[PDB]
RNA sequence: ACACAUGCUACAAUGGCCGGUACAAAGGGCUGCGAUGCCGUGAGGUGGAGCGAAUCCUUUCAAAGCCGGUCUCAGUUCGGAUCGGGGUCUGCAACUCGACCCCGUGAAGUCGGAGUCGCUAGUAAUCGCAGAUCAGCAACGCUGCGGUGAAUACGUUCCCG
């Protein structure tokens, strides 16, 4: 397969239509996904030592990367933290991993969540990046539904080369990602 | 990519109940996904139904029809 | 098995496995399983995905479930708490709505006990 | 649901009120019916025995009998 | 916001739910009791047989019982409070404040601290039935009727009169 499927349609159709919509006047301004990072929770650090290996395993086999365990910048006292405790890992995706993760979640993960009305268009930063919340898990058919005692949630971020925000709305609208006015 | 730490990453074949079939790389050992969801989103329909859900004055006139 | 949105258990009969959804009790299981044709004695391990298909299409088509009843019951209780009814006042203060005994009992509405 | 109760005194008064397109505060004895949606928009001075409470009638009031948009008991506790 | 008191339903397998089937006693009835039939899923609707009643109606009356199937010890096919929708009947009128039925909803509760109460044989325990008051019902109450039916009492030292 020369091109991943989402990228199979991205390399011609979304780029040609997005040039139609916006007259940049310069090819290679046209905006595309850079990375897809996934934001491991927990916060059970200090309280419970064992789980973070639950999250390392969790990030993995949702996508096939070893999540790099990301730890505390500083010990902030109220929510028990300690400098150097593991609090959630993340995985950065770029390329074939990015696109195969995206198409699969798009045609698999998003529909399943119960009462999944849509995703907010408003949730952009100042510059075209989209982040949304997966509260429970087991949206994915990769995880066997009896292997999984407590629900581990996560943030999923799409980061694009969108200099605006309606740039990113237009991409992620044409790209098969849901929204709901 | 590092060698031994990443899980195995295989082609897959995803099938829904209507038969609309998808081929992707994936992490599943089975090489397939027998799913019940296809690119047939119900938000468009669910939303319409929800919009249709409100309005009771008519229902009251219903009970009486007069 | 999986259905309309309720994760079915391992080993339950169908007229009990349908009951674990918010819109279905025992009688709806006895009428749904009579209309569709699935044996009520079937376990959930022995359930067919095509039986999930016909059963699922029937009970999302001709009956309402989890989101419709939670948003509908919620929207009707907040309907009578917005317009200013006396039952609205009962839902406001946290009191029994049917006008029943409030002097000694109706502890399931006041909840846990504080004693003065 | 053979025939729901109608408050014939309030029925006669209500019809007169809406034929002339006149809206007037009404001191009403009646705690028993909001029968037709012909009562929409009319202000009802509901009588819990002791004083009259003005109640605006909108579209959602249909099916709630008229008296208990005004409550009869008072409770604080402290 | 509470605290007491008498009751009822429970916390399950000596049980729950579905099917088949056997046995009571007493009572109640005129602008009352109201059958077969037909319409409902069911409260009930339509209709009036027949009775001032050892006759007719309350079905030939019950339920627990027995035979069978299913459930496999679980906050569950236990438990029904609560809440939403939808109804029926009574009444001029079911909002504050009626009962009943249908669909959903499905909480506390794993036999209960100090204590304390009842009962010595058709008794306790459990199971339905009728009545008075009453248009309707807060009836789980009260007064009665019958069904199935135990254990223990060595004995006056101790508590109570």
Coordinates of C-alpha atoms (C1' of nucleotides) in Angstrom, one line a residue:
Chain A
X1 CA 0.0 0.0 0.0
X2 CA 1.7 3.2 -1.2
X3 CA -0.6 5.4 0.8
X4 CA -2.6 4.9 4.0
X5 CA -6.3 5.2 3.2
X6 CA -7.1 8.5 4.9
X7 CA -3.9 9.8 3.1
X8 CA -5.0 8.0 0.0
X9 CA -8.0 10.4 -0.2
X10 CA -6.2 13.3 1.4
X11 CA -3.4 13.5 -1.2
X12 CA -5.9 14.4 -3.9
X13 CA -9.4 15.3 -2.8
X14 CA -9.2 17.3 0.4
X15 CA -6.2 19.2 -0.9
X16 CA -7.9 20.1 -4.2
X17 CA -11.1 21.1 -2.5
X18 CA -9.4 23.1 0.2
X19 CA -7.6 25.0 -2.5
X20 CA -11.0 25.6 -4.0
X21 CA -12.3 27.0 -0.7
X22 CA -9.3 29.1 0.2
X23 CA -7.2 30.9 -2.4
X24 CA -3.8 30.8 -0.7
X25 CA -2.3 31.3 -4.1
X26 CA 0.6 29.2 -3.0
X27 CA 0.8 25.4 -3.1
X28 CA 2.4 23.9 0.0
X29 CA 0.4 26.3 2.2
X30 CA -2.4 23.7 2.2
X31 CA -3.1 22.4 5.7
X32 CA -2.5 18.9 6.9
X33 CA -2.2 16.9 10.1
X34 CA 1.3 17.1 11.7
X35 CA 1.1 14.9 14.7
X36 CA -1.6 13.1 16.7
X37 CA -0.7 12.9 20.4
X38 CA -2.7 11.1 23.1
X39 CA -2.9 12.3 26.6
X40 CA -2.6 9.8 29.4
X41 CA -4.5 10.5 32.6
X42 CA -4.1 8.9 36.0
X43 CA -3.5 11.4 38.8
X44 CA -3.6 8.2 41.0
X45 CA 0.2 8.7 41.4
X46 CA 1.3 8.6 44.9
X47 CA -2.1 7.1 45.8
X48 CA -1.5 4.0 43.7
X49 CA 1.8 2.8 42.3
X50 CA 0.6 -0.1 40.0
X51 CA -1.8 1.6 37.6
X52 CA 0.7 3.6 35.6
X53 CA 1.9 0.3 34.1
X54 CA -1.8 -0.1 33.4
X55 CA -1.6 3.1 31.4
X56 CA 1.6 2.2 29.6
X57 CA -0.1 -0.9 28.5
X58 CA -3.3 1.0 27.7
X59 CA -1.7 3.5 25.4
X60 CA -0.1 0.6 23.7
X61 CA -2.4 -1.7 21.7
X62 CA -4.8 1.2 21.2
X63 CA -1.9 2.2 18.9
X64 CA 1.2 0.2 18.5
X65 CA 3.8 2.5 20.1
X66 CA 5.5 2.2 23.5
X67 CA 4.1 5.2 25.4
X68 CA 6.9 7.2 26.9
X69 CA 6.1 7.8 30.6
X70 CA 5.9 11.4 31.3
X71 CA 6.4 12.5 34.9
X72 CA 6.1 15.5 37.2
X73 CA 7.8 18.8 36.7
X74 CA 7.3 19.7 40.4
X75 CA 5.9 18.3 43.7
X76 CA 2.7 20.2 44.2
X77 CA 1.5 19.4 47.6
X78 CA -2.3 19.1 47.7
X79 CA -2.9 16.6 45.0
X80 CA -0.3 14.3 46.1
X81 CA 2.6 14.8 43.8
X82 CA 6.3 14.2 44.1
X83 CA 9.0 15.3 41.7
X84 CA 9.5 12.3 39.5
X85 CA 6.4 10.2 40.0
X86 CA 4.9 8.9 36.8
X87 CA 1.7 10.7 36.0
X88 CA 0.4 9.4 32.7
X89 CA 2.2 8.6 29.5
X90 CA 1.6 9.9 26.0
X91 CA 2.3 8.7 22.5
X92 CA 3.2 10.9 19.6
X93 CA 2.1 9.6 16.2
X94 CA 3.3 10.8 12.8
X95 CA 3.1 9.3 9.4
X96 CA 1.7 5.8 8.7
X97 CA 0.9 5.4 12.3
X98 CA -0.9 8.7 12.4
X99 CA -3.1 8.0 9.4
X100 CA -3.9 4.3 10.2
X101 CA -4.8 5.4 13.8
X102 CA -7.0 8.1 12.4
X103 CA -9.0 6.2 9.8
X104 CA -9.6 3.3 12.2
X105 CA -10.8 5.4 15.1
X106 CA -12.9 7.4 12.7
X107 CA -14.6 4.4 11.3
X108 CA -14.5 2.5 14.5
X109 CA -14.1 4.5 17.7
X110 CA -16.3 7.5 17.3
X111 CA -19.6 5.8 16.4
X112 CA -19.7 3.4 19.4
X113 CA -19.8 5.7 22.4
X114 CA -23.3 5.7 23.8
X115 CA -25.3 8.7 22.9
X116 CA -22.5 10.1 20.9
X117 CA -24.1 13.2 19.5
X118 CA -21.0 14.7 17.9
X119 CA -17.9 16.8 18.7
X120 CA -17.8 20.5 19.3
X121 CA -16.4 22.7 16.5
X122 CA -15.5 25.2 19.2
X123 CA -12.6 23.2 20.7
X124 CA -9.8 24.7 18.8
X125 CA -6.8 26.6 20.1
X126 CA -5.7 29.8 18.6
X127 CA -4.1 28.0 15.7
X128 CA -6.1 25.1 14.3
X129 CA -5.5 22.2 16.7
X130 CA -8.3 20.0 17.8
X131 CA -8.5 18.2 21.2
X132 CA -11.4 16.3 22.6
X133 CA -12.1 14.0 25.5
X134 CA -12.6 10.2 25.6
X135 CA -14.1 9.9 29.1
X136 CA -14.3 6.1 29.6
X137 CA -12.5 3.9 27.0
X138 CA -13.6 0.7 25.1
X139 CA -14.5 2.7 22.1
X140 CA -11.9 0.6 20.5
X141 CA -12.3 -3.0 19.4
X142 CA -8.6 -3.5 20.1
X143 CA -9.3 -3.9 23.8
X144 CA -11.1 -7.0 24.9
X145 CA -14.1 -5.9 27.0
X146 CA -13.4 -8.3 29.9
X147 CA -9.7 -7.5 30.1
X148 CA -10.5 -4.1 31.5
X149 CA -11.5 -3.4 35.1
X150 CA -11.4 0.4 35.6
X151 CA -12.0 2.9 32.8
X152 CA -8.9 4.8 31.8
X153 CA -9.7 8.0 29.8
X154 CA -7.5 10.1 27.5
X155 CA -7.2 13.3 25.5
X156 CA -6.6 13.0 21.7
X157 CA -5.1 16.0 20.0
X158 CA -4.9 16.6 16.2
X159 CA -2.3 19.2 15.4
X160 CA -2.4 20.7 11.9
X161 CA -0.6 23.3 9.9
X162 CA -3.7 25.5 10.1
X163 CA -2.8 29.2 10.5
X164 CA -6.4 29.9 11.4
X165 CA -9.2 28.0 13.1
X166 CA -11.8 27.7 10.3
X167 CA -8.9 26.3 8.3
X168 CA -8.9 23.4 10.7
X169 CA -12.7 23.2 10.8
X170 CA -12.7 23.0 7.0
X171 CA -10.0 20.3 6.9
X172 CA -11.4 18.2 9.8
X173 CA -14.9 18.7 8.3
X174 CA -13.8 17.5 4.8
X175 CA -11.6 14.8 6.5
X176 CA -14.1 12.4 7.8
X177 CA -14.2 13.7 11.4
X178 CA -17.6 14.5 13.0
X179 CA -19.1 17.8 14.2
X180 CA -22.5 19.1 15.1
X181 CA -23.7 22.7 14.7
Chain B
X1 CA 11.1 2.7 15.2
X2 CA 12.8 0.7 17.9
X3 CA 12.8 -3.0 17.5
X4 CA 11.6 -5.2 20.3
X5 CA 9.4 -3.0 22.4
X6 CA 6.6 -2.1 20.1
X7 CA 3.6 -4.5 19.8
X8 CA 3.0 -6.4 16.6
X9 CA 1.4 -4.3 13.9
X10 CA -0.6 -6.3 11.3
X11 CA -2.9 -5.7 8.4
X12 CA -6.6 -6.1 9.3
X13 CA -9.9 -6.5 7.5
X14 CA -12.9 -4.7 9.2
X15 CA -16.4 -5.9 8.4
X16 CA -19.8 -4.5 9.5
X17 CA -23.2 -6.1 9.5
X18 CA -24.2 -4.6 6.2
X19 CA -20.9 -5.9 4.7
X20 CA -19.2 -2.6 4.2
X21 CA -15.6 -3.6 4.4
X22 CA -12.4 -1.8 5.5
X23 CA -8.8 -2.8 5.2
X24 CA -6.3 -1.2 7.6
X25 CA -3.1 -1.8 9.5
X26 CA -3.9 -2.6 13.2
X27 CA -2.6 -4.1 16.4
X28 CA -5.1 -7.0 16.5
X29 CA -3.6 -10.5 16.5
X30 CA -6.8 -11.8 14.9
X31 CA -6.2 -9.9 11.6
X32 CA -9.8 -8.9 11.4
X33 CA -12.5 -7.0 13.3
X34 CA -16.1 -8.2 13.2
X35 CA -17.8 -4.8 14.1
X36 CA -21.4 -3.7 14.2
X37 CA -20.6 -0.1 13.1
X38 CA -19.9 1.2 9.6
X39 CA -19.6 4.7 8.1
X40 CA -23.4 5.1 8.7
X41 CA -23.5 7.7 11.4
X42 CA -26.7 8.0 13.3
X43 CA -26.0 11.4 14.7
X44 CA -27.8 12.9 11.7
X45 CA -30.8 10.8 12.4
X46 CA -30.5 10.8 16.2
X47 CA -30.4 14.6 16.2
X48 CA -33.4 14.8 14.0
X49 CA -35.3 12.5 16.3
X50 CA -34.3 14.6 19.3
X51 CA -35.4 17.8 17.6
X52 CA -38.7 16.0 16.8
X53 CA -39.0 15.0 20.4
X54 CA -40.3 18.3 21.9
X55 CA -43.7 19.9 21.7
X56 CA -46.6 19.0 24.0
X57 CA -49.5 21.4 23.4
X58 CA -50.3 19.3 20.4
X59 CA -50.2 16.2 22.6
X60 CA -52.7 17.8 25.0
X61 CA -55.0 18.7 22.1
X62 CA -54.5 15.0 21.2
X63 CA -56.0 13.7 24.4
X64 CA -59.1 15.8 23.7
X65 CA -59.2 16.1 19.9
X66 CA -61.8 18.9 20.3
Chain C
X1 CA -23.0 -9.7 24.1
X2 CA -23.6 -6.1 23.0
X3 CA -26.9 -4.5 22.1
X4 CA -28.6 -1.0 22.1
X5 CA -26.0 0.3 24.6
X6 CA -26.2 -2.1 27.5
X7 CA -23.3 -4.6 27.9
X8 CA -25.0 -7.9 28.4
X9 CA -23.6 -10.4 31.0
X10 CA -22.1 -13.7 30.5
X11 CA -24.8 -16.2 31.4
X12 CA -28.3 -14.8 31.6
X13 CA -31.5 -15.8 29.9
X14 CA -32.9 -13.4 27.2
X15 CA -36.0 -12.3 29.1
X16 CA -33.6 -11.1 31.8
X17 CA -30.8 -10.0 29.5
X18 CA -33.2 -7.6 27.8
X19 CA -34.3 -6.2 31.2
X20 CA -30.9 -4.6 32.0
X21 CA -31.7 -1.8 29.5
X22 CA -33.4 1.3 30.9
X23 CA -36.5 1.0 28.8
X24 CA -37.2 -2.7 29.2
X25 CA -38.5 -4.6 32.2
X26 CA -40.0 -8.1 32.3
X27 CA -43.2 -7.6 30.4
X28 CA -41.4 -5.8 27.5
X29 CA -39.1 -8.8 27.4
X30 CA -42.1 -11.1 27.2
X31 CA -43.6 -9.1 24.3
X32 CA -40.3 -8.3 22.4
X33 CA -39.2 -12.0 22.6
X34 CA -42.7 -13.0 21.4
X35 CA -42.7 -10.5 18.5
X36 CA -39.2 -11.1 17.2
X37 CA -38.9 -14.9 17.7
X38 CA -35.9 -15.4 19.9
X39 CA -36.3 -18.1 22.6
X40 CA -36.4 -16.5 26.1
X41 CA -34.4 -19.5 27.4
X42 CA -31.3 -18.6 25.3
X43 CA -28.2 -17.7 27.2
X44 CA -26.1 -14.7 26.3
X45 CA -23.1 -16.8 25.3
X46 CA -25.4 -18.6 22.8
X47 CA -26.7 -15.4 21.3
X48 CA -26.4 -14.7 17.5
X49 CA -25.3 -11.4 16.0
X50 CA -28.1 -11.6 13.5
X51 CA -30.4 -12.0 16.5
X52 CA -28.8 -8.9 17.8
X53 CA -29.5 -7.3 14.4
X54 CA -33.3 -8.1 14.3
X55 CA -33.8 -7.6 18.0
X56 CA -31.8 -4.4 18.0
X57 CA -33.7 -2.9 15.0
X58 CA -37.0 -3.9 16.6
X59 CA -36.3 -2.3 19.9
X60 CA -34.8 0.8 18.6
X61 CA -37.5 1.1 16.0
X62 CA -40.7 0.5 18.0
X63 CA -39.7 1.4 21.5
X64 CA -37.4 3.9 23.3
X65 CA -34.3 3.3 25.3
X66 CA -31.4 4.8 27.4
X67 CA -30.9 8.3 26.0
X68 CA -34.5 8.9 25.0
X69 CA -35.9 8.0 28.4
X70 CA -33.1 9.7 30.4
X71 CA -33.5 12.9 28.5
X72 CA -37.2 12.6 28.4
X73 CA -37.8 11.9 32.1
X74 CA -35.2 14.5 32.9
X75 CA -36.8 17.0 30.5
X76 CA -40.2 16.4 32.0
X77 CA -39.2 16.8 35.6
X78 CA -37.4 20.0 34.7
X79 CA -40.5 20.9 32.7
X80 CA -42.6 20.9 35.8
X81 CA -39.9 22.5 37.9
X82 CA -39.6 25.5 35.5
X83 CA -43.3 26.4 35.2
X84 CA -43.9 26.8 39.0
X85 CA -46.2 23.9 39.8
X86 CA -46.8 22.5 43.3
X87 CA -45.1 19.3 42.2
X88 CA -42.4 21.6 41.0
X89 CA -42.2 22.9 44.5
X90 CA -41.9 19.4 45.8
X91 CA -39.1 18.7 43.4
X92 CA -37.5 22.0 44.5
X93 CA -37.5 21.4 48.2
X94 CA -36.8 17.7 48.0
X95 CA -40.1 16.4 49.3
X96 CA -42.4 13.5 48.1
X97 CA -44.4 14.6 45.1
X98 CA -47.6 12.5 45.4
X99 CA -48.8 14.5 48.5
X100 CA -48.0 11.6 50.8
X101 CA -46.9 11.4 54.4
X102 CA -44.1 13.9 55.3
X103 CA -44.3 13.9 59.0
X104 CA -42.6 10.7 59.9
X105 CA -41.7 8.7 56.8
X106 CA -40.7 9.7 53.2
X107 CA -37.1 9.2 54.1
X108 CA -36.2 8.0 50.6
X109 CA -36.6 11.6 49.4
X110 CA -35.0 13.4 52.2
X111 CA -32.3 10.9 52.1
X112 CA -29.6 10.3 54.7
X113 CA -30.5 11.4 58.2
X114 CA -29.3 14.5 60.1
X115 CA -30.7 14.6 63.6
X116 CA -31.3 17.8 65.6
Chain D
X1 CA -61.4 11.0 30.0
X2 CA -65.1 11.2 29.2
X3 CA -65.2 14.9 29.7
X4 CA -62.7 17.0 31.7
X5 CA -64.0 19.6 34.3
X6 CA -64.5 23.0 32.9
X7 CA -65.3 25.6 35.7
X8 CA -68.5 27.0 34.1
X9 CA -68.3 30.4 35.9
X10 CA -64.7 30.8 34.8
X11 CA -65.7 29.4 31.4
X12 CA -68.3 32.2 30.9
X13 CA -65.9 34.8 32.2
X14 CA -63.0 33.6 30.1
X15 CA -65.0 33.6 26.8
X16 CA -66.1 37.2 27.4
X17 CA -62.5 38.1 28.2
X18 CA -61.1 36.7 24.9
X19 CA -64.0 37.8 22.6
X20 CA -63.3 41.5 23.4
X21 CA -59.5 40.8 23.2
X22 CA -59.3 42.4 26.7
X23 CA -56.8 41.1 29.3
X24 CA -57.7 41.8 33.0
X25 CA -56.4 40.6 36.3
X26 CA -58.9 38.2 37.6
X27 CA -59.8 37.5 41.2
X28 CA -60.6 33.8 40.8
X29 CA -62.0 31.4 43.4
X30 CA -61.4 28.4 41.1
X31 CA -58.7 25.9 42.0
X32 CA -60.0 23.1 39.9
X33 CA -59.4 23.4 36.1
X34 CA -57.2 24.9 33.4
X35 CA -59.5 23.1 30.9
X36 CA -59.1 24.4 27.4
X37 CA -56.0 26.1 25.8
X38 CA -58.4 29.0 25.5
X39 CA -57.1 30.1 28.9
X40 CA -53.6 30.9 27.5
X41 CA -52.4 34.4 28.2
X42 CA -55.1 35.4 30.8
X43 CA -53.8 36.4 34.2
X44 CA -55.5 34.4 37.0
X45 CA -55.7 35.7 40.6
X46 CA -55.7 32.3 42.2
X47 CA -57.2 32.2 45.7
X48 CA -55.6 29.9 48.3
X49 CA -58.1 31.1 50.9
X50 CA -56.4 34.2 52.1
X51 CA -55.0 36.3 49.2
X52 CA -54.9 36.3 45.4
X53 CA -51.7 35.4 43.6
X54 CA -51.4 36.5 39.9
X55 CA -50.5 33.6 37.6
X56 CA -49.7 34.0 33.9
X57 CA -50.9 31.1 31.8
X58 CA -48.7 29.9 29.0
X59 CA -48.8 26.9 26.7
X60 CA -47.2 24.5 29.3
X61 CA -50.0 25.0 31.8
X62 CA -52.5 22.9 29.9
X63 CA -53.1 19.8 31.9
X64 CA -52.4 21.2 35.3
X65 CA -55.4 22.2 37.4
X66 CA -55.5 25.8 38.2
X67 CA -55.1 26.2 41.9
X68 CA -51.6 25.0 42.4
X69 CA -49.6 27.4 40.5
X70 CA -50.2 29.1 43.9
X71 CA -49.3 27.0 47.0
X72 CA -51.4 26.9 50.1
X73 CA -48.9 26.0 52.8
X74 CA -45.8 27.9 54.1
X75 CA -42.8 26.2 55.6
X76 CA -39.3 27.3 56.5
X77 CA -38.2 25.2 59.5
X78 CA -35.9 27.7 61.4
Chain E
rA1 C1' -34.3 19.4 59.9
rC2 C1' -36.5 15.8 63.4
rA3 C1' -37.9 12.0 67.8
rC4 C1' -41.1 8.2 69.5
rA5 C1' -45.1 4.3 68.9
rU6 C1' -48.1 0.3 66.7
rG7 C1' -48.3 -2.3 62.1
rC8 C1' -47.3 -4.1 56.9
rU9 C1' -43.4 -5.7 52.8
rA10 C1' -38.9 -7.5 52.9
rC11 C1' -33.5 -8.9 53.0
rA12 C1' -34.4 -14.7 49.3
rA13 C1' -33.7 -21.7 46.9
rU14 C1' -38.4 -24.4 53.2
rG15 C1' -37.4 -19.3 47.8
rG16 C1' -38.8 -16.5 43.1
rC17 C1' -41.5 -16.9 38.1
rC18 C1' -44.5 -19.9 34.2
rG19 C1' -48.0 -24.0 33.3
rG20 C1' -51.5 -28.0 35.2
rU21 C1' -54.5 -29.4 39.4
rA22 C1' -57.4 -30.4 44.9
rC23 C1' -59.8 -29.1 49.2
rA24 C1' -63.0 -24.3 53.3
rA25 C1' -65.8 -21.6 56.8
rA26 C1' -68.6 -17.9 57.5
rG27 C1' -70.9 -13.9 55.7
rG28 C1' -73.1 -9.6 52.2
rG29 C1' -77.1 -7.7 48.6
rC30 C1' -82.9 -2.5 46.1
rU31 C1' -82.8 2.7 43.1
rG32 C1' -78.5 -3.1 45.7
rC33 C1' -75.5 -8.0 44.1
rG34 C1' -75.3 -8.0 39.1
rA35 C1' -74.3 -13.7 35.5
rU36 C1' -73.5 -16.0 30.0
rG37 C1' -72.1 -13.2 25.8
rC38 C1' -69.3 -9.2 23.1
rC39 C1' -65.0 -5.0 23.3
rG40 C1' -60.2 -4.5 25.8
rU41 C1' -53.6 -6.5 27.9
rG42 C1' -55.7 -4.9 32.2
rA43 C1' -58.2 -2.0 35.6
rG44 C1' -63.0 -2.0 33.3
rG45 C1' -66.8 -0.8 29.1
rU46 C1' -71.5 -2.5 26.7
rG47 C1' -75.5 -5.5 28.5
rG48 C1' -78.9 -7.2 31.5
rA49 C1' -80.2 -13.4 32.9
rG50 C1' -81.6 -14.0 38.0
rC51 C1' -82.7 -12.9 42.7
rG52 C1' -85.4 -8.9 49.0
rA53 C1' -82.5 -14.5 48.2
rA54 C1' -80.2 -22.7 52.1
rU55 C1' -82.8 -21.0 45.3
rC56 C1' -80.0 -15.7 42.1
rC57 C1' -75.3 -13.0 42.6
rU58 C1' -70.8 -12.8 45.4
rU59 C1' -68.0 -17.5 39.6
rU60 C1' -69.3 -24.0 40.6
rC61 C1' -66.0 -19.9 45.7
rA62 C1' -60.6 -19.7 48.2
rA63 C1' -55.0 -19.0 49.1
rA64 C1' -50.9 -21.6 51.3
rG65 C1' -50.9 -27.4 49.1
rC66 C1' -49.6 -31.1 45.4
rC67 C1' -47.2 -32.4 40.1
rG68 C1' -44.0 -30.3 36.5
rG69 C1' -40.5 -26.7 34.1
rU70 C1' -36.9 -22.7 34.8
rC71 C1' -33.7 -19.7 37.8
rU72 C1' -27.9 -21.4 40.7
rC73 C1' -26.5 -17.9 45.6
rA74 C1' -25.8 -13.0 42.8
rG75 C1' -27.5 -6.7 45.5
rU76 C1' -29.5 -11.2 41.6
rU77 C1' -35.3 -13.6 37.4
rC78 C1' -34.3 -11.2 45.6
rG79 C1' -36.7 -6.4 47.0
rG80 C1' -40.6 -3.0 45.8
rA81 C1' -39.8 2.1 47.6
rU82 C1' -39.3 6.3 44.4
rC83 C1' -39.9 8.8 39.7
rG84 C1' -41.8 9.5 34.1
rG85 C1' -45.2 8.4 30.5
rG86 C1' -50.1 6.2 29.5
rG87 C1' -55.1 5.0 31.3
rU88 C1' -60.0 3.4 34.1
rC89 C1' -63.7 4.1 37.7
rU90 C1' -66.3 7.0 41.6
rG91 C1' -68.1 11.7 42.1
rC92 C1' -70.7 18.9 40.7
rA93 C1' -65.3 18.3 41.4
rA94 C1' -59.5 13.7 42.0
rC95 C1' -54.3 20.6 42.0
rU96 C1' -53.3 21.1 47.3
rC97 C1' -55.6 15.3 48.7
rG98 C1' -58.7 9.1 45.9
rA99 C1' -58.1 4.1 44.7
rC100 C1' -57.0 0.7 40.8
rC101 C1' -54.6 -1.1 36.1
rC102 C1' -50.5 -0.9 31.9
rC103 C1' -45.3 0.3 30.4
rG104 C1' -40.9 1.8 32.0
rU105 C1' -37.9 3.2 36.3
rG106 C1' -35.4 -0.5 40.3
rA107 C1' -33.5 2.8 46.0
rA108 C1' -32.6 1.1 51.1
rG109 C1' -32.2 -3.7 52.7
rU110 C1' -27.0 -9.5 53.6
rC111 C1' -31.7 -11.1 60.0
rG112 C1' -30.7 -6.1 62.7
rG113 C1' -26.4 -2.5 69.4
rA114 C1' -28.4 -1.6 74.8
rG115 C1' -32.7 -3.7 75.3
rU116 C1' -37.7 -5.8 74.7
rC117 C1' -42.5 -8.3 73.5
rG118 C1' -46.0 -12.2 72.6
rC119 C1' -47.5 -17.2 73.3
rU120 C1' -48.5 -23.7 76.9
rA121 C1' -52.8 -26.5 71.9
rG122 C1' -55.9 -26.6 67.2
rU123 C1' -52.2 -22.3 70.8
rA124 C1' -47.7 -20.0 68.4
rA125 C1' -46.3 -19.5 63.4
rU126 C1' -48.0 -18.8 58.4
rC127 C1' -52.3 -18.7 54.4
rG128 C1' -56.3 -16.5 52.1
rC129 C1' -61.8 -15.1 52.9
rA130 C1' -66.0 -11.8 54.5
rG131 C1' -68.1 -7.8 57.1
rA132 C1' -69.2 -3.0 59.5
rU133 C1' -68.2 2.5 58.3
rC134 C1' -68.6 3.6 52.7
rA135 C1' -70.4 7.3 46.1
rG136 C1' -65.3 6.5 46.2
rC137 C1' -61.1 5.2 49.3
rA138 C1' -55.6 6.4 52.6
rA139 C1' -58.0 -0.7 55.3
rC140 C1' -51.3 -2.8 55.6
rG141 C1' -56.6 -0.8 60.4
rC142 C1' -60.7 -3.1 63.1
rU143 C1' -64.2 -7.2 63.9
rG144 C1' -64.9 -12.1 62.6
rC145 C1' -64.4 -16.9 59.4
rG146 C1' -62.0 -21.0 58.3
rG147 C1' -56.9 -23.8 56.0
rU148 C1' -52.0 -26.0 57.2
rG149 C1' -50.2 -26.6 61.6
rA150 C1' -45.1 -26.9 65.8
rA151 C1' -41.4 -26.7 69.9
rU152 C1' -41.0 -26.7 75.3
rA153 C1' -42.5 -26.7 80.6
rC154 C1' -36.4 -30.1 84.7
rG155 C1' -38.8 -26.9 88.3
rU156 C1' -39.5 -22.2 92.2
rU157 C1' -33.1 -20.3 93.6
rC158 C1' -33.6 -15.4 90.7
rC159 C1' -36.6 -10.7 88.1
rC160 C1' -42.2 -9.0 87.9
rG161 C1' -47.3 -8.7 90.0

